Amino acid sequence: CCARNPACRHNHPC
Amino acid sequence: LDRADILYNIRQTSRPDVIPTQRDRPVAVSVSLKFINILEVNEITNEVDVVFWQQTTWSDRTLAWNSSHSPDQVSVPISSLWVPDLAAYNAISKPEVLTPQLARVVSDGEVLYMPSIRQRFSCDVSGVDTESGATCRIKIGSWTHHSREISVDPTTENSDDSEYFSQYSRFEILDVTQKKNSVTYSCCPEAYEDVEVSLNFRKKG
Amino acid sequence: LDRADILYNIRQTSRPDVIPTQRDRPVAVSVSLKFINILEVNEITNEVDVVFWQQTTWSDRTLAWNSSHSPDQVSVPISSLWVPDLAAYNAISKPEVLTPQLARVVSDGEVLYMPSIRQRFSCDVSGVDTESGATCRIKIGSWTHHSREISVDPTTENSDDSEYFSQYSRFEILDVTQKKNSVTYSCCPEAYEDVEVSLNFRKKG
Amino acid sequence: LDRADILYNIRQTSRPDVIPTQRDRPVAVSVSLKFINILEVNENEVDVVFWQQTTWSDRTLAWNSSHSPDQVSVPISSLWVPDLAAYNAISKPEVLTPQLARVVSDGEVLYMPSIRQRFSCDVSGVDTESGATCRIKIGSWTHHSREISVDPTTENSDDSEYFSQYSRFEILDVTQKKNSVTYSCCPEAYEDVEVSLNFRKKG
Amino acid sequence: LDRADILYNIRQTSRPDVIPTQRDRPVAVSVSLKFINILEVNETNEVDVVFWQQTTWSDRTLAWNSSHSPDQVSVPISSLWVPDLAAYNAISKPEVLTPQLARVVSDGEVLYMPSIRQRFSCDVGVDTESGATCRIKIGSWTHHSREISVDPTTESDDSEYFSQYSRFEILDVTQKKNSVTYSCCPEAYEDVEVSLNFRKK
Amino acid sequence: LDRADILYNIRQTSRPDVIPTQRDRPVAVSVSLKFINILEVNEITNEVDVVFWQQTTWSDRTLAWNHSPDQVSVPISSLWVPDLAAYNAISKPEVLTPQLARVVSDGEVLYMPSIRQRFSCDVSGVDTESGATCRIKIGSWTHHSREISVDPTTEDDSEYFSQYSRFEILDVTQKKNSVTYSCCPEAYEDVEVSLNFRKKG
């Protein structure tokens, strides 16, 4: 995933 | 459409005070807590202060737009959207939001809101110095929407729990489990769905 | 009617600053406290901090809707409603509301508001370690509406008050009584109705 | 008229940012403190809770009550309220109660908030028989004597009718007396009520 | 004109978000601190102070003819431009203790004197004869010297307003004007540095 | 144009809730911390409380005008501001100063609030010569790199640092970090600011 980064996690819910 | 147009259309159609139910099915809301830190543990007067990202997702078709020639997501202030009325039933302080109060909205109407929250809970701290540690239970569900209106589900996302946690804390995370429950109180004849999050942690050493 | 229509109609018809009296009868308000926790007892200062759900109901028939194929209840922000100006006459801190500020309106015009509130009171805590324990007295009624305008009544003891109480508190509830009264002061020609809540509690050990 | 009509008419005529002076006479404001509790004495600050009974008139609010209700509750954001301050306070007043006043059909307004506030006072003798005294000065922050007069109501030593039985302290005496102060900051005189709360620790 | 008319006209012409510069001259702002109390001294080098911040300036847009009319009115600060003063070395947000009303004079003079509680970093000698000194630096946050000038007023009894029940006493209060240029920012920023020399009784 | 006209024109055309992207380029935001104080280092809990000026700049060409004034002060509620957060903060940022930004006639916006904030940071060697280092990670809370890019500005020297602190600044360095994940074609950016500091003696 890209789950660790807040922005990425917003753009790609993990 | 440009971002201005999307945002303009969202203000026209979005009803922040109206749960976006579809054909009188519940709005399916998912909640996932990512723990960032544990501060001010108190072995007397039970009590812990935690910082966590509250990942909250749901869908609201009233927000949707055609993204064929347009951006596929935008950031929108939460005051322009319906947001679920989530509360930690066992919190002893108001949630303090640390981060900009913006949600991410996808062109299909998926919404992600993930505030960083500092909050104090009543929790069992006996054993925080031992190997098996202490466990703090946080119960989160809708304050006013029972199970025909809002369903609440944990996300599948299992053991990666230390990645988000401050490496400089005095404490370490042993385990986090997120389990669905459905509670009826005598105050209120319907059932309210919640996620119970169990944070198993201990002092380092 | 859909939720959107009802919420829209509530904003049009509801007068948040106008007590919904009918034919110069008092608005009957029922108030009942469910204790969730007792925190920060202070044997020095005789003060205690409590968390309680304040179950509050009353009616405003102007809000009713009788239409077919409609919800039985909606969730509405309290700023769209008249709410009774309830206060704990003997509180020593401002009530801190922990929960989303939404009330339920039922299709018959009943309004149900149950905020979680944290608040500090002056009470005699000397015997908190003894068998018979300490008692905290909380008086709740309307701040500005005397008995011709607002009546205040407890609801009848259905549950044990311990149903809602945190098992992780340092304290346990021995007894809760909620009794109707009337207060008068020399400030004021009329009597004010209240509920007097006696919270009898003690330390677990 | 029903309550809705009265409240509607009050919003039409009421000017919350305009002192309701009549023909350039001062608005007579009466103020009285009723002590509810004394909370956190510190060897030199003390914390008090008091109901601030405040009345004045605003004839613009008046209505005909011959076949109508005589009094209503109104949010203070719809009313002019006096800009009262405790000149010697060391904390912001914390208002504990709903911010609603009573308006009477003749234009009398009654506002009685419960306030928690900290003051600087000499508490050394709080454990002695004669006790400690806390002095609170209350008047208008910006309105001098030609614009606002401030007067205590009659009954001075103030019976602890309102005082918590569960306080660690007891009230020996309360006196509430009128004064008129000029500071060098400001060329006009400001009226105040000086409240002396004489209290001591219980045995 | 009655007070209602004046207040109404002030709302019509007053631009709370627009500095009332007149001919591209600075708005001259004067500041004077009157100390009421010193609380919660900490050995962390922090002190908590209460002070009346006497602030004055002119905004000719607010002026009216005082024929019949009042010479002054009380106006909520949300209806006025107010200087964006900050204590550059404060470590807490200023807590305003008093009603947020300013006095406007018919000539356009504005007088705003909030009571403020605020915490500062300063060197706490507090038990010695010569005492400790707390420096409070006050100036415009965003307006350099061509837009806002900041000046002390000429002094009169530093202890006049001071609580006699405080644990501390005021030895002296002094003012210095400063004009500072940082490398962040090519213009000069004016401040007034107020030195509160105090000690434990 | 006078200041009133400029401010009026900004409110038309400024969209506080819309990122002012130009032709699908990111809004280039530069962020730089100037440390003013270090307040409550805690060796027990690994937490530090700091005060810093957060120098933040970016452009919004829609605001531009113009011989007649070149800059104005504008309340931030009239502007889009980047949704920057310190990812490792453990308290809400407390803004100490008036919430006004500077807008330049070319559309540059400069916002520099004074902020008090607590971070989780390694304080172990704060009494040693080489000292402790506190890392503060800053980026957009909801925007990836094609919408908002974040870069440090070029100046590091404690020009702004209180001489009355218990601590002294040894060094401040700023590095940009930029990751692309295989899930996702766009890049994620933050600025890591390293505050190397120690107790004086």
Numbering used by the authors:
A (entry chain G): 2 to 15
B (entry chain A), C (entry chain E): 1 to 205
D (entry chain B): 1 to 43, 46 to 205
E (entry chain D): 1 to 43, 45 to 125, 127 to 157, 159 to 204
F (entry chain C): 1 to 66, 69 to 157, 160 to 205
Sentences from the paper on this structure:
Classical α-conotoxins are characterised by a CICII-Xm-CIII-Xn-CIV framework forming three possible disulfide connectivities: globular (I–III, II–IV), ribbon (I–IV, II–III) and bead (I–II, III–IV).
The asymmetric unit contained one turbine-like pentamer and only one binding pocket was occupied by either gAusIA or rAusIA, possibly influenced by crystal packing. The C-loop was displaced outward by 10.3 ± 0.34 Å in the occupied binding interface, which is comparable to previous co-crystal structures of bound α-conotoxins (based on the measurement between Cys187 Cα atom in the complex with HEPES/Ls-AChBP structure), while the C-loops of other binding interfaces remained in a closed conformation. While the electron density for both disulfide bonds of gAusIA is apparent, well-defined electron density is only presented for the CysII-CysIII disulfide bond of rAusIA. Despite this difference in rigidity, the extent and nature of the pair-wise interactions contributed by gAusIA and rAusIA are similar.
